[PDB]
Amino acid sequence: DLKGHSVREWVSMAGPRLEIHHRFKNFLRTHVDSHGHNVFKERISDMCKENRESLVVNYEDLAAREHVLAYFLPEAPAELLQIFDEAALEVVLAMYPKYDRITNHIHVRISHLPLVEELRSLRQLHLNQLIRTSGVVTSCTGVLPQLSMVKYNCNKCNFVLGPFCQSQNQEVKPGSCPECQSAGPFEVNMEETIYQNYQRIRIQESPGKVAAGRLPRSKDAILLADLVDSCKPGDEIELTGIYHNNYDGSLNTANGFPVFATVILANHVAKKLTDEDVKMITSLSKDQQIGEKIFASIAPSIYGHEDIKRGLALALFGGEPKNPGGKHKVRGDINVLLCGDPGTAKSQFLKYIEKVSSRAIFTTGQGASAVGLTAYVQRHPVSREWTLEAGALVLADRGVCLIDEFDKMNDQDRTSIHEAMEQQSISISKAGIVTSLQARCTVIAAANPIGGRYDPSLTFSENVDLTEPIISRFDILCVVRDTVDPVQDEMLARFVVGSHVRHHPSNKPLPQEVLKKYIIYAKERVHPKLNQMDQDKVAKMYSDLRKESMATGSIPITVRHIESMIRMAEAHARIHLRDYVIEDDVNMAIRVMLESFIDTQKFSVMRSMRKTFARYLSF
Amino acid sequence: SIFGGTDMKKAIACLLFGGSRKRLPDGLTRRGDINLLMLGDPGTAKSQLLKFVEKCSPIGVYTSGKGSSAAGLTASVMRDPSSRNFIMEGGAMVLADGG
Amino acid sequence: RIQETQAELPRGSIPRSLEVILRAEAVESAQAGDKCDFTGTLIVVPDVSKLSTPGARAETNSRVSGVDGYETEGIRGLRALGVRDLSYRLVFLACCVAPTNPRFGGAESIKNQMTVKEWEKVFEMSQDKNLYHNLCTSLFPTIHGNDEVKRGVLLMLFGGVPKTTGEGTSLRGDINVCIVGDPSTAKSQFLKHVEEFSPRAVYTSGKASSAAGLTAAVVRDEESHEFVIEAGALMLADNGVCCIDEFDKMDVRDQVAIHEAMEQQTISITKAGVKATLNARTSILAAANPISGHYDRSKSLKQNINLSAPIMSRFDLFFILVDECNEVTDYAIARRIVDLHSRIEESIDRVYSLDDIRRYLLFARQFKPKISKESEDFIVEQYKHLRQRDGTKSSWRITVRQLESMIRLSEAMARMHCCDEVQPKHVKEAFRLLNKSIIRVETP
Amino acid sequence: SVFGRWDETKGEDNIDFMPTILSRFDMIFIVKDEHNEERDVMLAKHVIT
Amino acid sequence: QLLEEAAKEVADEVTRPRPSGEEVLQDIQVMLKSDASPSSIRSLKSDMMSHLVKIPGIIIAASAVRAKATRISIQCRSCRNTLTNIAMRPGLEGYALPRKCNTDQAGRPKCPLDPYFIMPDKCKCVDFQTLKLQELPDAVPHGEMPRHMQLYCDRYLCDKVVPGNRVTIMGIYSIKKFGLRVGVGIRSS
Numbered sequence A: 001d002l003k004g005h006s007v008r009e010w011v012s013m014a015g016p017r018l019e020i021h022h023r024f025k026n027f028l029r030t031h032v033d034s035h036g037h038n039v040f041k042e043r044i045s046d047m048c049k050e051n052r053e054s055l056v057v058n059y060e061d062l063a064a065r066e067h068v069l070a071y072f073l074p075e076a077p078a079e080l081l082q083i084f085d086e087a088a089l090e091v092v093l094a095m096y097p098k099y100d101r102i103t104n105h106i107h108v109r110i111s112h113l114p115l116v117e118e119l120r121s122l123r124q125l126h127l128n129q130l131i132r133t134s135g136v137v138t139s140c141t142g143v144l145p146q147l148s149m150v151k152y153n154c155n156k157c158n159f160v161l162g163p164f165c166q167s168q169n170q171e172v173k174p175g176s177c178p179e180c181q182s183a184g185p186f187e188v189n190m191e192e193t194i195y196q197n198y199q200r201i202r203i204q205e206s207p208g209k210v211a212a213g214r215l216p217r218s219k220d221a222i223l224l225a226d227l228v229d230s231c232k233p234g235d236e237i238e239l240t241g242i243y244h245n246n247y248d249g250s251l252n253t254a255n256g257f258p259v260f261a262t263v264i265l266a267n268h269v270a271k272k273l274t275d276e277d278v279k280m281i282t283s284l285s286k287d288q289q290i291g292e293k294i295f296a297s298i299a300p301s302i303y304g305h306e307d308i309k310r311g312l313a314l315a316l317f318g319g320e321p322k323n324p325g326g327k328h329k330v331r332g333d334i335n336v337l338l339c340g341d342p343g344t345a346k347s348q349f350l351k352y353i354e355k356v357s358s359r360a361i362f363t364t365g366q367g368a369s370a371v372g373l374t375a376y377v378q379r380h381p382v383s384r385e386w387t388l389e390a391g392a393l394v395l396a397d398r399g400v401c402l403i404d405e406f407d408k409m410n411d412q413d414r415t416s417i418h419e420a421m422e423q424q425s426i427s428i429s430k431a432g433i434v435t436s437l438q439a440r441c442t443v444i445a446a447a448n449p450i451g452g453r454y455d456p457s458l459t460f461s462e463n464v465d466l467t468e469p470i471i472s473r474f475d476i477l478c479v480v481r482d483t484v485d486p487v488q489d490e491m492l493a494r495f496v497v498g499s500h501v502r503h504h505p506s507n508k509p510l511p512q513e514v515l516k517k518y519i520i521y522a523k524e525r526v527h528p529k530l531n532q533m534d535q536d537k538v539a540k541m542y543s544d545l546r547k548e549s550m551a552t553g554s555i556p557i558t559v560r561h562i563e564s565m566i567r568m569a570e571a572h573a574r575i576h577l578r579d580y581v582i583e584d585d586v587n588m589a590i591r592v593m594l595e596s597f598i599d600t601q602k603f604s605v606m607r608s609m610r611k612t613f614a615r616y617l618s619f
Numbered sequence B: 001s002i003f004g005g006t007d008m009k010k011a012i013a014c015l016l017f018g019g020s021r022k023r024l025p026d027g028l029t030r031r032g033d034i035n036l037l038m039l040g041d042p043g044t045a046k047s048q049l050l051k052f053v054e055k056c057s058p059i060g061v062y063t064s065g066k067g068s069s070a071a072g073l074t075a076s077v078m079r080d081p082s083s084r085n086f087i088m089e090g091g092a093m094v095l096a097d098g099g
Numbered sequence C: 001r002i003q004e005t006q007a008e009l010p011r012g013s014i015p016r017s018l019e020v021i022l023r024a025e026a027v028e029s030a031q032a033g034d035k036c037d038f039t040g041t042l043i044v045v046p047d048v049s050k051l052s053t054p055g056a057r058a059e060t061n062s063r064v065s066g067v068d069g070y071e072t073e074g075i076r077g078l079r080a081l082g083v084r085d086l087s088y089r090l091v092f093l094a095c096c097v098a099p100t101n102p103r104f105g106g107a108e109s110i111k112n113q114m115t116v117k118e119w120e121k122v123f124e125m126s127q128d129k130n131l132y133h134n135l136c137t138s139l140f141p142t143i144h145g146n147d148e149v150k151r152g153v154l155l156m157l158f159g160g161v162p163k164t165t166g167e168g169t170s171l172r173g174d175i176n177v178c179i180v181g182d183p184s185t186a187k188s189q190f191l192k193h194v195e196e197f198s199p200r201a202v203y204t205s206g207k208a209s210s211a212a213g214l215t216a217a218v219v220r221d222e223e224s225h226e227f228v229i230e231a232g233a234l235m236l237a238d239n240g241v242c243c244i245d246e247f248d249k250m251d252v253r254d255q256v257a258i259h260e261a262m263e264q265q266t267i268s269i270t271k272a273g274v275k276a277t278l279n280a281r282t283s284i285l286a287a288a289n290p291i292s293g294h295y296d297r298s299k300s301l302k303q304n305i306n307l308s309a310p311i312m313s314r315f316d317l318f319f320i321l322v323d324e325c326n327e328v329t330d331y332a333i334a335r336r337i338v339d340l341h342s343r344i345e346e347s348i349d350r351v352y353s354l355d356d357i358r359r360y361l362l363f364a365r366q367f368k369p370k371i372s373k374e375s376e377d378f379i380v381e382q383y384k385h386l387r388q389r390d391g392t393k394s395s396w397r398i399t400v401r402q403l404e405s406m407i408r409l410s411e412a413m414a415r416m417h418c419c420d421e422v423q424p425k426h427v428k429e430a431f432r433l434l435n436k437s438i439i440r441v442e443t444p
Numbered sequence D: 001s002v003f004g005r006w007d008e009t010k011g012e013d014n015i016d017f018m019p020t021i022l023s024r025f026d027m028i029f030i031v032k033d034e035h036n037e038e039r040d041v042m043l044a045k046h047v048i049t
Numbered sequence E: 001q002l003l004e005e006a007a008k009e010v011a012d013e014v015t016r017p018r019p020s021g022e023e024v025l026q027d028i029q030v031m032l033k034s035d036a037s038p039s040s041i042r043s044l045k046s047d048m049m050s051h052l053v054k055i056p057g058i059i060i061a062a063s064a065v066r067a068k069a070t071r072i073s074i075q076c077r078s079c080r081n082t083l084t085n086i087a088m089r090p091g092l093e094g095y096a097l098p099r100k101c102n103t104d105q106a107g108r109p110k111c112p113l114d115p116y117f118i119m120p121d122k123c124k125c126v127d128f129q130t131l132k133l134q135e136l137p138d139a140v141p142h143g144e145m146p147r148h149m150q151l152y153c154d155r156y157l158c159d160k161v162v163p164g165n166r167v168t169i170m171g172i173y174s175i176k177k178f179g180l181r182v183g184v185g186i187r188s189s
């Protein structure tokens, strides 16, 4: 019921405390379901099955069945939340009385609060009220331990001053010891205390929602005991919490308006491997067109460059790493370099790889890089803790670093990427950190040739500004020429304009994550083995290719290329999800490796090799 | 695990043990080590032999001429104006002393 | 924080700045970069420890003394008497806030905000034919010739339609223009015209802008713990125009920064203890001196100027202004500027006033053209013809980025005429604009 | 060596290091894979082994 | 500490008939180790606090080996009576000095308030080192940042590890105790 006094004082009175606690118990037990299920029974069943420590309830259901509580909720949320903690504790103990050891506490979260305010507009009129809001996490410190029921050693006599509850507002302070009667220098008993997880995030208004002439505004937020690490930086998150002012934040200091900071005790944060995967992946792997389906599922937002779609497929699935003895580093990573004249989807390719492949990061030879190739240690600014920011490769240790504009990286990045793909370990020796972080990168890269146009007369090495050892070890070199042509340009223009009209704001092969599950399955679980290839055929293949390449200015095919051939064979076997490499796979790996080698070779020699080796490129 | 290059394998063998340093009664010093230069082609396993020899030495560091990722080649020492200590960045040469 | 308007500066004077407090309901009305009139009190807020020299200090007038061992001297004495310096600072207390040059007396919402007279004015403006050349003349009554630059800059002001893919790739909608030419060819003059004309038209020149002020900076809230992300030139030009002069003479460290802005329409600053992702959808009008001072028509554009290849790729339109010596044109220019100087106030015939066209821009901006199927067919076939031209050789080669430029300019012409459909008229004119922009390198 | 591999025409010139850093050394091997059909086919055998 | 003095007793009896000088039974540190899998540095919630935790990490720096006390003798300023052999606690845990001299014989008057000055020479101290352990780079998830932890070594855990050496380290989670920012109850763990 209602009276002249305020809502908060009302709900503070004991009579209505029992009233609303009874009402919460009542609808917890009785609000069966939309369609007669008693959903609270099943929710509590799962809650205690995992020991989640936290229930969540829908505000629409709350208000619809019992509306007085819903109206009271934003007015004096703290008191209602405490009582619902107690009532939920009662009902969960009723369902499972064995729960008593489990945390002695249940939190309750409220979802779908109808009235969302915007971080631009949170005024005095929302203090001490439960609001709903949206934003992006700009920072999120680590999980810290907070006092929740603290016991103090009176260090005059070592009496254990009993467990004081710790509100978020002001630090608890014992008056005196019940034994020796001193307000002594008390100090926390580290053990008998039962702490509580504390994490501090900072959300800000999303640029997609910020207005024209503006700076997005940022509100702090505190996560406690179950929601810590429920959201990482850059996550678009809805936040529901008690917008809050009265803790100790106030500019009572000199030189300041009497102006208060604010926080949000977050009461609900909402962001915005498997089984049967073997079944689906193997069932489609039966099809045996799966190689071309993968080749046509890789990079659908690009036209042409089928050679590079295939090549990046082989780079994505990789080979296998081996070490005969503890003496020979032979690698499973297939490194790729697109070299292309401008405006030919190099960065488009790279961003597709970043989107699709797990443990992918992006980096640029220029200084605009999100993540850097070098490794450095400093005090990271948004956290101000002294990190070892290990570079881009190490951060992409398993999967892919993607080096866009590979042809302009500063000489330090040249040194670092060379030493990465050569050693496969990045050797840091800056402050006192003389270590070697292993970097099993699978580098993809893009490079614009000299003069902004590919020059078929000169060779690849001398018309791209990447020095010989760097250009060598890349398992695939691909050339991208923007050759003017009627039908090609017609097709490209029609595709682009179709995308544009489709992407007007009025209109608002295998799927990509299907391919991603395929990627991890065939990258870790499946290791095709090789005793089933015409060893003599490939040995004579190297013989014939190098024998033709014997000439001046004709740096020949070598063992680098023959091991790259085996890597590509394994990769195609992986791609076929087989457990044994087959002559078909060996033929395809031969085809792609030889295509890469001839197109590396300049025009006249390219035509000689193409004419005399068309039998393999025929397949 | 490399085909042939038998003279190079024996050369690496002699290299790994190295000579014997001479400090003379005057005081001068003569080296007790061996240097192996390996000019040549791409195709042969030059960097791979470098890789193994680094793995197989008791203490050994395999670097590029152009320093290393967040690691120089020669040592450097630099004053720190705040604390005045001469911090000593250790290169490959000194980080593999005796190596 | 506000500062003196540029009109009111004394001689040799830094612009003074004072702090203005905005109490309830007049609170978010001001915004960074605006030109706002404020009305209210001038108050004084107490300051402390502003000076190292002792000044005016209050103290109680009670005549107490100090007993022995507790004598009211030194720190005890000052605390006992309650001594406190009285140092103040002017802090304006804005009771109300309006734009100093209001746009209106108040697409459908802005249309409702339109008064009847301005509504019929912009209506007959849209219904007008020859509005193309009329807008050219009104924007640039001073200029003679340079019709291609007039057209490109007008289309730049109207802008294209930003779009975004299902995957999340932010297709550019702005259209950056570059003016490159021999010295004293009205390049900086065009940029100044755009600056003085439009709102959200920030201006900067070459090496006069270090990167921090160029794009964004950071300060700590002097009151609270939070941090204020100070807005740089790109931000203040957000959803508008940034006129960069001596574009070729920008350091790499910041030309890459504006390149990032051009690629992503956004810059994320993480520095000195605050991280944020600031939006900047501005369009860049650049001026670039050729290498050697004079453009050379026997060389390609990429070797006449010294921009980074990705920057040059991003730049939507490139105009070449060669200072040839033809005397009919010379007579025209001399007559024009001397006529202006003799008759300053008159001798301007902007057929639509600056306020009229500015309101027209603000009203037109919110119309987002489609692209009909016939226009799409014409687009693809005309780009094919452009590639056939490319296949002699132009001073800067044709790629798919020029297709992107042409479609964005077609969108911006539809935006000029406030249409909901880009037609072959717009497509033809956009192609003509690009075709005349791209010139054949002239070997002897 | 500078010119990709060891071309026989540039013998006594196909090295760019200074003599005052070839002096320091104690053995300096050149490695060229010029014309050995049996060796190279056996090398393919060896690496895939 | 029980294990430590237990080791001390068994040590003295095994080495019992000791020679001259080396007779005062020296303190016997007892470090630990295990064979179970280390747990990640991201798994240190509140509930694993003041327990026994083994973790994997990578050192990234190491403060100097400096001197923290374990026994400290103070003496009053009036009567100069000492109060020797005070059990200074281990780890990062300060100790509020005693407040009033306890003689009942300082004279006809009494000793002042807060009379004790620490006797520096009569403090028996140890080595300690504040390490900055950072999460394992391969352990760090994709988008996140490397977590950290302040570490406190002891007598013969000092200088056994140099900056950059990955460690599996067995110790005790703890918060500092120096006498009891939009947050409260958050001491430096």
Ligand SMILES: Nc1ncnc2c1ncn2[C@@H]1O[C@H](COP(=O)(O)OP(=O)(O)OP(=O)(O)O)[C@@H](O)[C@H]1O
Pocket (backbone or CB within 6 Å): A301, A302, A303, A304, A340, A341, A342, A343, A344, A345, A346, A347, A348, A349, A448, A492, A496, C309, C310, C313, C400, C401, C404
């Ligand atoms: N084959 C293609 N399919 C689709 N879009 C393409 C293709 N080739 C070029 N484009 C378009 O060209 C524009 C430039 O693409 P991208 O970012 O890859 O440039 P680039 O050639 O790598 O240039 P730079 O050297 O400046 O990085 C993009 O709009 C891309 O859509």
Ligand SMILES: Nc1ncnc2c1ncn2[C@@H]1O[C@H](COP(=O)(O)OP(=O)(O)O)[C@@H](O)[C@H]1O
Pocket (backbone or CB within 6 Å): A329, A330, A559, A560, A563, B001, B002, B003, B040, B041, B042, B043, B044, B045, B046, B047, B048, B049, D043, D046, D047
């Ligand atoms: N004789 C060989 N047997 C097997 N593999 C070889 C041989 N020679 C070279 N390789 C392969 O070539 C790759 C690169 O050779 P590398 O060690 O870089 O020497 P170089 O620096 O001269 O290229 C190595 O990873 C190695 O696997």
Ligand SMILES: Nc1ncnc2c1ncn2[C@@H]1O[C@H](COP(=O)(O)OP(=O)(O)O)[C@@H](O)[C@H]1O
Pocket (backbone or CB within 6 Å): C142, C143, C144, C145, C146, C182, C183, C184, C185, C186, C187, C188, C189, C190, C333, C336, C337
């Ligand atoms: N076509 C023209 N029409 C009108 N004025 C011109 C023309 N060409 C040059 N001028 C005059 O030249 C002056 C300087 O031109 P400006 O663009 O500043 O040179 P720069 O491009 O080197 O900065 C302008 O003030 C303008 O009056």
Ligand SMILES: [Mg+2]
Pocket (backbone or CB within 6 Å): A346, A347, A348, A404, A405, A446
């Ligand atoms: Mg690119």
Ligand SMILES: [Mg+2]
Pocket (backbone or CB within 6 Å): B046, B047
């Ligand atoms: Mg090598």
Ligand SMILES: [Mg+2]
Pocket (backbone or CB within 6 Å): C187, C188, C245
């Ligand atoms: Mg100028």
Ligand SMILES: [Zn+2]
Pocket (backbone or CB within 6 Å): A154, A155, A156, A157, A158, A159, A177, A178, A179, A180, A181, A182
């Ligand atoms: Zn007590």
Ligand SMILES: [Zn+2]
Pocket (backbone or CB within 6 Å): E076, E077, E078, E079, E080, E081, E101, E102, E103, E106, E111, E115
């Ligand atoms: Zn005393």
